[PDB]
C-alpha cells in the first residue's frame, strides 16, 4: 500500500524446496510491504480459486447468494471431486473450493454485472474474456500478489464497494486458523500443472490479525506437479513463523 | 426451547472426573435439545465471562463500541492479569476475557440501556442490580444452559434485537476453532472458586457449524479449585467428539 521493500533473505525458504515464487507481506500499522522478489510480486497470474473471494462478495451483492445460510444443493450429477458431491454452505464451498458452485454463481451474476464489480474492486487486469464460468481458471483474468494484498486490505477494512454485511459474511467464510493470540483468514488457488515450460500457478492469500496488528499476505509459485501443492502454505507459514507472526 | 431430552450415555464423562455439571446439546435448533441432567439444564447460574457476548452486542448497538476495529487502550494502570495490560481489539478482549474492558463498556451503556437490552434478549433472570460493572461477576444475574443455547441460536440466526452487522462482528470475535470440516464459536466463563459449601461455576458455551448442520451447546459445572478449570472444555469436547461433531 504505502511502500514495498525487497528482502532477499526470505529466498532461503524458496531455495530449500527448489520453488520459483513470491511472498508479499504487508503490515497495516506501518503501511509497508516486504517481498522476496519485487519483479514477481508485480507479475500477474490466473487467480484460480482465490477468485472465490470476489465472486462470493458479488454473488451476495447481486442477491444471487441470498445470505450466509444459503445451501448450495447438489443435484446428484457427478462432479470432479468427491468432496464436492454434497450440499454445501457458502463457507463449505469456499473451504473445499467447489468450482461448480462458483461457476453457477458467475453464470447468474452475468457478464455485465461481473465486469462492473471487478472495476469497482480494481481486481487484476479486469479481463473476464474466456467464458463467464471460466475466465478466472483458464481465461484472460490475471492478478498480481501486490494487487491481491490491496484487495484483501480493502475487504478487511470493509472498504470494498459492497455492504459491510456482505463483506463480513465472506470474511467469516475465510477463517482458516483460530488461536487465542491470532486469527488467520485465507484462501488457496491452483490453476493446474500447466504446459511444457508453461507451468501453472498456486496461490495462498489472506491476512493475520494478531494483538492490534494486521498482516496481509499473498504467495504464489510456479507449479508443474500436484505433489508440490502443499508448499503454497508451508513456505509462507515458515516465513511468517520466522517473523514471529504465527 | 421445545423439548429437552435426557441422555444418560454422557454421564461417564462427568463421573470419571467427579464433576457435578450439565451439558446441553441441540442439533439444528433449540426445538430439540439433549442433556445429561434435566433439572440442571434449566438451573440458573452467574454467567461470568459468557456475559461478554451480550455485553459486546449491546456495546455496539449503543455505539459505546464504535465498530469492530475499535482499540481498547490500556491506561497503564495495574490490571488483575498481565494479559490484560495492553491495548486490545474487541476479539482480543473477548479471547483473553479482559474484565476491565467490559466493565467500562457496561458503565457507559448504563443501567437503563443495559436493562432494556437484556429484556429484549430474554437473557436469564435479567437482574442487573447491585452495581453496573459487576452484576455478571458477583451480582444477581443468573442464566441457565438452556437459555444460553436459545440466546446463541438467536445470535447464529441474526435474530437478536440488534443489527445483523453487529451480530456478525461479535460472531467473528467468538471463533475459537477453524477446520475445513467445521467451525467452532465459543466462550468460557468462571465465577471463581466460591466460598465454603458454595462452589463457583465454570462455563463453556457456543456452537459448531459442520457440513450444513449447526449444533448449539452449553456446559456448566460446579468448581471450587482452579485446577479443575480445563474440564469445562474437555468434558464437552469429549462428548461432542463421541457424537461425531468435532
Ligand atoms: Na496494501
Ligand atoms: Na483489572
Ligand atoms: Na479452560
Curated annotation (Swiss-Prot), chains A, B:
Cellular compartment(s): Periplasm
One MF term in the entry's GO annotations: penicillin binding
pH relationship of activity: Optimum pH is between 6 and 7.
Enzyme Commission designation: 3.5.2.6
GO CC entries: periplasmic space; plasma membrane
Active site: 49
UniProt keyword annotation of Disulfide bond present: yes
Activity regulation summary: Activated, with respect to most beta-lactam substrates, in the presence of 0.05 M sodium bicarbonate.
InterPro entries membership: Bact_Transpept/Beta-Lactamase, Beta-lactam/transpept-like, Beta-lactam_class-D_AS, PCN-bd_Tpept
Residue numbers carrying N6-carboxylysine: 52
NCBIfam families: bla_class_D_main (NF012161), blaOXA-10_like (NF000386)
Quaternary organization: Dimer.
Name of this chain's protein: Beta-lactamase OXA-10
Organism: Pseudomonas aeruginosa
Amino acid at each position: 500500500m504505502g511502500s514495498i521493500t525487497e528482502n532477499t533473505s526470505w529466498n532461503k525458504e524458496f531455495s530449500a524446496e527448489a520453488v520459483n515464487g513470491v511472498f508479499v507481506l504487508c503490515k497495516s500499522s506501518s503501511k509497508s510491504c516486504a517481498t522476496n522478489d519485487l519483479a514477481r510480486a508485480s507479475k500477474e497470474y490466473l487467480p484460480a480459486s482465490t477468485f472465490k473471494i470476489p465472486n462470493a462478495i458479488i454473488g451476495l451483492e447481486t442477491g444471487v447468494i441470498k445470505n450466509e445460510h444459503q445451501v448450495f444443493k447438489w443435484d446428484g450429477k457427478p462432479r470432479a471431486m468427491k468432496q464436492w458431491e454434497r450440499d454445501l454452505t457458502l463457507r463449505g464451498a469456499i473451504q473445499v473450493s467447489a468450482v461448480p458452485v462458483f461457476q453457477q454463481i458467475a453464470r447468474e451474476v452475468g457478464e455485465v454485472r461481473m465486469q462492473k464489480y471487478l472495476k469497482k474492486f480494481s481486481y487484476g487486469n479486469q479481463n473476464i474474456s474466456g467464458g463467464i464460468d471460466k475466465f478466472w481458471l483458464e481465461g484472460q483474468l490475471r492478478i498480481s500478489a501486490v494487487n491481491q494484498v490491496e484487495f484483501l486490505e480493502s475487504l478487511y477494512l470493509n472498504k470494498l464497494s459492497a455492504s459491510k454485511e456482505n463483506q463480513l459474511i465472506v470474511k467469516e467464510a475465510l477463517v482458516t486458523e483460530a488461536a487465542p493470540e491470532y486469527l488467520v483468514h485465507s484462501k488457496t488457488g491452483f490453476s493446474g500443472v500447466g504446459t511444457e515450460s508453461n507451468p501453472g500457478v498456486a496461490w495462498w492469500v489472506g491476512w493475520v490479525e494478531k494483538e492490534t496488528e494486521v498482516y496481509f499476505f499473498a504467495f504464489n509459485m510456479d507449479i508443474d506437479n500436484e505433489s508440490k501443492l502443499p508448499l503454497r502454505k508451508s513456505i509462507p507459514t515458515k516465513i511468517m513463523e520466522s517473523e514471529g507472526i504465527i
